[PDB]
Protein backbone atom coordinates (compact mmCIF):
# COMPACT_ATOMS: atom_id res chain seq x y z
CA UNK A 1 0.00 0.00 0.00
CA UNK A 2 0.92 3.69 -0.32
CA UNK A 3 0.09 7.08 1.13
CA UNK A 4 0.34 10.65 -0.05
CA UNK A 5 -0.22 13.91 1.81
CA UNK A 6 0.13 17.61 1.03
CA UNK A 7 2.44 19.62 3.28
CA UNK A 8 2.01 23.39 3.59
CA UNK A 9 4.33 26.11 4.95
CA UNK A 10 3.06 27.61 8.20
CA UNK A 11 4.03 31.18 7.28
CA UNK A 12 5.47 33.36 4.54
CA UNK A 13 9.08 32.42 5.40
CA UNK A 14 8.68 28.61 5.22
CA UNK A 15 9.61 28.43 8.91
CA UNK A 16 7.99 24.98 9.08
CA UNK A 17 5.62 22.71 7.16
CA UNK A 18 2.44 21.10 8.51
CA UNK A 19 0.75 17.97 7.16
CA UNK A 20 -2.74 16.78 8.15
CA UNK A 21 -2.78 13.48 10.05
CA UNK A 22 -5.85 11.47 11.09
CA UNK A 23 -5.72 10.00 14.61
CA UNK A 24 -8.35 7.89 16.34
CA UNK A 25 -11.81 6.52 15.54
CA UNK A 26 -13.65 8.55 14.50
CA UNK A 27 -10.79 10.48 12.89
CA UNK A 28 -9.41 13.53 14.68
CA UNK A 29 -7.38 15.58 12.21
CA UNK A 30 -4.28 17.34 13.54
CA UNK A 31 -1.68 19.30 11.58
CA UNK A 32 1.70 17.78 12.41
CA UNK A 33 5.29 18.84 11.65
CA UNK A 34 6.98 15.90 9.89
CA UNK A 35 10.46 15.73 11.41
CA UNK A 36 13.17 13.43 10.01
CA UNK A 37 15.42 14.62 12.86
CA UNK A 38 13.46 12.98 15.69
CA UNK A 39 11.54 9.80 16.36
CA UNK A 40 8.55 10.67 18.55
CA UNK A 41 4.95 11.18 17.45
CA UNK A 42 3.65 13.61 20.05
CA UNK A 43 0.53 15.77 20.00
CA UNK A 44 -1.21 18.50 21.93
CA UNK A 45 -4.03 16.77 23.78
CA UNK A 46 -6.84 17.11 26.30
CA UNK A 47 -4.15 16.25 28.89
CA UNK A 48 -1.91 19.24 28.06
CA UNK A 49 -1.96 21.88 30.80
CA UNK A 50 -4.54 24.47 29.79
CA UNK A 51 -2.23 27.49 30.06
CA UNK A 52 0.26 25.94 27.59
CA UNK A 53 -2.35 25.65 24.79
CA UNK A 54 -3.09 28.66 22.54
CA UNK A 55 -5.24 27.79 19.53
CA UNK A 56 -3.84 24.33 18.75
CA UNK A 57 -6.15 21.49 17.83
CA UNK A 58 -5.95 18.88 20.61
CA UNK A 59 -6.18 15.09 20.55
CA UNK A 60 -8.86 13.74 22.91
CA UNK A 61 -8.21 10.01 23.48
CA UNK A 62 -11.46 9.71 25.44
CA UNK A 63 -13.39 10.33 22.19
CA UNK A 64 -11.52 7.59 20.27
CA UNK A 65 -12.92 4.06 20.40
CA UNK A 66 -9.50 2.67 19.35
CA UNK A 67 -7.31 4.54 21.85
CA UNK A 68 -5.59 2.54 24.58
CA UNK A 69 -3.45 3.89 27.40
CA UNK A 70 0.03 2.37 27.30
CA UNK A 71 0.16 1.67 31.00
CA UNK A 72 3.26 2.96 32.78
CA UNK A 73 4.88 4.50 29.69
CA UNK A 74 6.22 8.05 29.75
CA UNK A 75 8.16 10.23 27.33
CA UNK A 76 10.37 13.28 27.63
CA UNK A 77 12.19 14.94 24.75
CA UNK A 78 14.38 18.01 24.24
CA UNK A 79 15.22 19.40 20.81
CA UNK A 80 18.45 21.03 19.67
CA UNK A 81 16.88 24.50 19.89
CA UNK A 82 16.03 24.02 23.58
CA UNK A 83 12.37 23.11 23.03
CA UNK A 84 10.93 20.29 25.13
CA UNK A 85 7.73 18.39 25.95
CA UNK A 86 6.65 15.36 27.96
CA UNK A 87 3.66 13.27 29.01
CA UNK A 88 2.10 9.82 28.75
CA UNK A 89 1.51 7.42 25.86
CA UNK A 90 -1.56 6.04 24.12
CA UNK A 91 -1.80 3.63 21.24
CA UNK A 92 -4.30 4.47 18.51
CA UNK A 93 -4.93 4.27 14.78
CA UNK A 94 -3.02 6.85 12.71
CA UNK A 95 -3.49 7.57 9.01
CA UNK A 96 -1.43 9.76 6.68
CA UNK A 97 -2.81 10.40 3.21
CA UNK A 98 -4.68 7.10 3.07
CA UNK A 99 -1.93 5.02 4.73
CA UNK A 100 -3.19 3.56 8.02
CA UNK A 101 -1.21 2.11 10.95
CA UNK A 102 -3.01 0.45 13.86
CA UNK A 103 -1.49 0.46 17.33
CA UNK A 104 0.78 3.46 16.73
CA UNK A 105 2.24 5.04 19.85
CA UNK A 106 0.70 8.50 20.23
CA UNK A 107 2.58 10.46 22.88
CA UNK A 108 0.16 12.81 24.64
CA UNK A 109 1.91 16.00 25.76
CA UNK A 110 1.12 16.94 29.34
CA UNK A 111 3.74 19.71 29.33
CA UNK A 112 5.14 21.67 26.37
CA UNK A 113 7.78 24.38 26.20
CA UNK A 114 6.83 27.96 25.38
CA UNK A 115 8.00 27.86 21.76
CA UNK A 116 5.38 25.20 20.96
CA UNK A 117 2.62 27.08 22.81
CA UNK A 118 3.11 30.31 20.86
CA UNK A 119 2.98 28.39 17.53
CA UNK A 120 -0.77 27.84 17.06
CA UNK A 121 -0.35 26.33 13.58
CA UNK A 122 1.55 23.20 14.74
CA UNK A 123 -0.48 20.59 16.65
CA UNK A 124 2.46 18.23 17.15
CA UNK A 125 5.37 16.39 15.58
CA UNK A 126 5.65 13.17 13.57
CA UNK A 127 9.18 11.83 13.90
CA UNK A 128 10.72 10.05 10.92
CA UNK A 129 14.28 9.37 12.11
CA UNK A 130 15.21 5.87 13.24
CA UNK A 131 13.33 4.26 16.11
CA UNK A 132 16.49 3.99 18.24
CA UNK A 133 15.96 7.70 19.09
CA UNK A 134 12.41 7.32 20.43
CA UNK A 135 12.09 8.58 24.01
CA UNK A 136 9.31 6.34 25.36
CA UNK A 137 10.32 4.59 28.59
CA UNK A 138 10.57 1.80 29.67
CA UNK A 139 9.45 0.24 26.36
CA UNK A 140 10.85 2.08 23.33
CA UNK A 141 8.28 2.66 20.58
CA UNK A 142 8.51 2.50 16.79
CA UNK A 143 7.94 5.44 14.45
CA UNK A 144 5.06 5.68 11.99
CA UNK A 145 7.41 4.81 9.13
CA UNK A 146 8.77 1.75 10.94
CA UNK A 147 5.27 0.46 11.73
CA UNK A 148 4.07 1.01 8.15
CA UNK A 149 7.20 -0.44 6.50
CA UNK A 150 5.97 -4.01 6.08
CA UNK A 151 2.75 -3.01 4.30
CA UNK A 152 4.36 -0.38 2.07
CA UNK A 153 4.92 -1.31 -1.56
CA UNK A 154 8.51 -0.06 -1.16
CA UNK A 155 10.09 0.82 2.23
CA UNK A 156 10.60 4.46 1.23
CA UNK A 157 9.15 7.88 1.79
CA UNK A 158 9.91 11.02 -0.17
CA UNK A 159 9.95 14.69 0.78
CA UNK A 160 9.06 17.24 -1.91
CA UNK A 161 9.01 20.53 -0.02
CA UNK A 162 7.89 23.69 -1.79
CA UNK A 163 9.43 27.16 -1.82
CA UNK A 164 6.66 29.44 -0.47
CA UNK A 165 4.23 26.80 -1.77
CA UNK A 166 2.66 23.48 -0.74
CA UNK A 167 4.56 20.26 -1.25
CA UNK A 168 4.13 16.49 -0.89
CA UNK A 169 5.15 13.67 1.44
CA UNK A 170 4.74 10.28 -0.24
CA UNK A 171 4.98 6.90 1.50
CA UNK A 172 5.70 3.64 -0.31
CA UNK A 173 6.45 4.83 -3.85
CA UNK A 174 8.65 7.20 -5.86
CA UNK A 175 6.76 9.68 -8.07
CA UNK A 176 8.87 9.73 -11.23
CA UNK A 177 7.03 12.85 -12.47
CA UNK A 178 8.15 14.96 -9.48
CA UNK A 179 11.84 15.39 -10.39
CA UNK A 180 14.12 15.95 -13.37
CA UNK A 181 17.05 13.80 -14.44
CA UNK A 182 18.22 10.92 -12.27
CA UNK A 183 18.15 10.33 -8.53
CA UNK A 184 21.62 10.16 -6.97
CA UNK A 185 21.76 7.81 -3.98
CA UNK A 186 24.31 8.10 -1.18
CA UNK A 187 25.03 5.93 1.83
CA UNK A 188 23.44 6.60 5.22
CA UNK A 189 24.95 6.01 8.66
CA UNK A 190 22.37 5.10 11.31
CA UNK A 191 24.91 5.06 14.15
CA UNK A 192 23.46 8.19 15.79
CA UNK A 193 19.83 7.45 14.89
CA UNK A 194 19.71 10.16 12.20
CA UNK A 195 19.51 10.13 8.42
CA UNK A 196 23.24 10.94 8.40
CA UNK A 197 25.17 11.20 5.15
CA UNK A 198 28.29 12.79 3.66
CA UNK A 199 28.10 15.62 1.14
CA UNK A 200 30.93 15.75 -1.38
CA UNK A 201 31.55 19.51 -1.35
CA UNK A 202 30.13 22.90 -2.18
CA UNK A 203 30.25 26.01 -4.35
CA UNK A 204 29.22 29.62 -3.80
CA UNK A 205 27.44 31.31 -6.70
CA UNK A 206 29.28 30.64 -9.96
CA UNK A 207 32.56 29.91 -8.15
CA UNK A 208 34.67 26.77 -8.30
CA UNK A 209 33.40 23.63 -6.62
CA UNK A 210 35.38 22.79 -3.48
CA UNK A 211 35.64 19.03 -3.03
CA UNK A 212 35.45 18.40 0.71
CA UNK A 213 33.55 15.92 2.86
CA UNK A 214 30.75 17.43 4.94
CA UNK A 215 29.02 15.02 7.30
CA UNK A 216 25.50 16.07 8.21
CA UNK A 217 21.89 15.03 8.68
CA UNK A 218 18.82 15.41 6.47
CA UNK A 219 16.35 17.10 8.83
CA UNK A 220 12.92 18.23 7.58
CA UNK A 221 12.28 19.58 11.09
CA UNK A 222 15.05 22.18 10.98
CA UNK A 223 14.39 25.38 9.05
CA UNK A 224 17.89 26.54 8.11
CA UNK A 225 21.11 25.08 6.70
CA UNK A 226 23.82 24.72 9.38
CA UNK A 227 27.33 24.10 8.01
CA UNK A 228 30.94 24.37 9.28
CA UNK A 229 32.31 27.82 10.01
CA UNK A 230 34.76 27.70 7.09
CA UNK A 231 31.99 27.05 4.56
CA UNK A 232 29.62 29.63 6.03
CA UNK A 233 32.28 32.33 6.14
CA UNK A 234 33.14 31.67 2.48
CA UNK A 235 29.49 32.08 1.49
CA UNK A 236 28.81 35.28 3.39
CA UNK A 237 32.09 36.86 2.26
CA UNK A 238 30.45 37.13 -1.18
CA UNK A 239 27.57 39.31 0.14
CA UNK A 240 28.32 43.02 0.48
CA UNK A 241 27.84 44.22 4.04
CA UNK A 242 27.10 40.77 5.48
CA UNK A 243 28.42 40.12 8.99
CA UNK A 244 27.97 37.76 11.92
CA UNK A 245 25.98 39.49 14.68
CA UNK A 246 26.28 38.38 18.29
CA UNK A 247 23.09 40.19 19.32
CA UNK A 248 21.08 38.59 16.53
CA UNK A 249 22.75 35.20 16.84
CA UNK A 250 23.99 34.65 13.31
CA UNK A 251 24.88 36.14 9.96
CA UNK A 252 22.75 39.09 8.81
CA UNK A 253 22.94 41.02 5.57
CA UNK A 254 21.53 44.25 4.11
CA UNK A 255 18.03 43.55 2.87
CA UNK A 256 18.97 45.38 -0.36
CA UNK A 257 21.64 42.82 -1.25
CA UNK A 258 21.12 40.01 -3.74
CA UNK A 259 22.21 36.61 -2.54
CA UNK A 260 24.36 34.13 -4.48
CA UNK A 261 23.23 30.57 -4.86
CA UNK A 262 24.74 27.74 -2.82
CA UNK A 263 25.59 24.38 -4.38
CA UNK A 264 26.10 21.18 -2.40
CA UNK A 265 27.41 17.87 -3.71
CA UNK A 266 25.74 14.47 -3.63
CA UNK A 267 28.25 11.96 -4.92
CA UNK A 268 29.06 13.28 -8.39
CA UNK A 269 25.77 15.20 -8.62
CA UNK A 270 25.10 18.81 -7.65
CA UNK A 271 22.07 20.39 -5.96
CA UNK A 272 21.73 24.15 -6.44
CA UNK A 273 20.00 26.24 -3.75
CA UNK A 274 18.81 29.49 -5.39
CA UNK A 275 19.89 32.64 -3.59
CA UNK A 276 16.28 33.65 -2.88
CA UNK A 277 15.87 30.53 -0.69
CA UNK A 278 18.55 31.87 1.68
CA UNK A 279 16.70 35.15 2.42
CA UNK A 280 14.73 34.92 5.67
CA UNK A 281 13.62 38.55 5.73
CA UNK A 282 14.09 41.43 8.17
CA UNK A 283 15.34 40.54 11.65
CA UNK A 284 12.50 42.72 12.99
CA UNK A 285 9.53 44.50 11.43
CA UNK A 286 10.73 47.51 9.47
CA UNK A 287 14.44 46.68 9.83
CA UNK A 288 16.79 46.94 6.86
CA UNK A 289 18.91 44.03 8.18
CA UNK A 290 17.85 40.60 6.93
CA UNK A 291 18.58 37.18 8.45
CA UNK A 292 20.57 34.59 6.50
CA UNK A 293 19.37 31.07 5.75
CA UNK A 294 22.89 29.58 5.96
CA UNK A 295 24.39 29.59 9.45
CA UNK A 296 27.32 28.08 11.31
CA UNK A 297 27.00 24.68 12.98
CA UNK A 298 29.88 25.38 15.39
CA UNK A 299 27.54 25.93 18.34
CA UNK A 300 25.57 22.75 17.54
CA UNK A 301 28.15 20.00 17.02
CA UNK A 302 26.54 18.54 13.90
CA UNK A 303 25.86 19.87 10.41
CA UNK A 304 22.17 20.09 9.50
CA UNK A 305 20.72 19.96 5.97
CA UNK A 306 17.44 21.59 6.92
CA UNK A 307 14.49 22.81 4.86
CA UNK A 308 16.58 25.48 3.06
CA UNK A 309 18.58 22.68 1.39
CA UNK A 310 15.93 19.95 1.18
CA UNK A 311 13.30 22.10 -0.57
CA UNK A 312 15.72 22.62 -3.47
CA UNK A 313 15.54 18.87 -4.19
CA UNK A 314 13.33 15.81 -4.41
CA UNK A 315 14.59 13.68 -1.51
CA UNK A 316 14.12 9.91 -1.13
CA UNK A 317 14.40 8.42 2.36
CA UNK A 318 15.10 4.77 1.52
CA UNK A 319 14.49 2.67 4.63
CA UNK A 320 15.65 -0.62 3.13
CA UNK A 321 17.81 -2.95 5.22
CA UNK A 322 20.77 -0.89 4.00
CA UNK A 323 19.34 2.66 4.18
CA UNK A 324 20.23 5.28 1.57
CA UNK A 325 19.31 8.88 0.74
CA UNK A 326 18.37 9.86 -2.81
CA UNK A 327 18.56 13.42 -4.16
CA UNK A 328 17.19 14.72 -7.44
CA UNK A 329 16.85 18.14 -9.00
CA UNK A 330 13.32 19.38 -9.59
Ligand SMILES: NCc1ccc(C(F)(F)F)cc1
Pocket residue numbers: 035036037038079080081219220221222300302304
Ligand atom coordinates in the same frame (compact mmCIF):
# COMPACT_ATOMS: atom_id res chain seq x y z
N1 LIG B 1 14.59 18.29 13.94
C1 LIG B 1 14.92 17.48 15.10
C2 LIG B 1 16.35 17.74 15.59
C3 LIG B 1 16.64 18.88 16.32
C4 LIG B 1 17.93 19.11 16.76
C5 LIG B 1 18.93 18.19 16.47
C6 LIG B 1 20.36 18.41 16.95
F1 LIG B 1 20.50 19.67 17.44
F2 LIG B 1 20.63 17.51 17.95
F3 LIG B 1 21.22 18.21 15.91
C7 LIG B 1 18.63 17.05 15.75
C8 LIG B 1 17.34 16.82 15.30
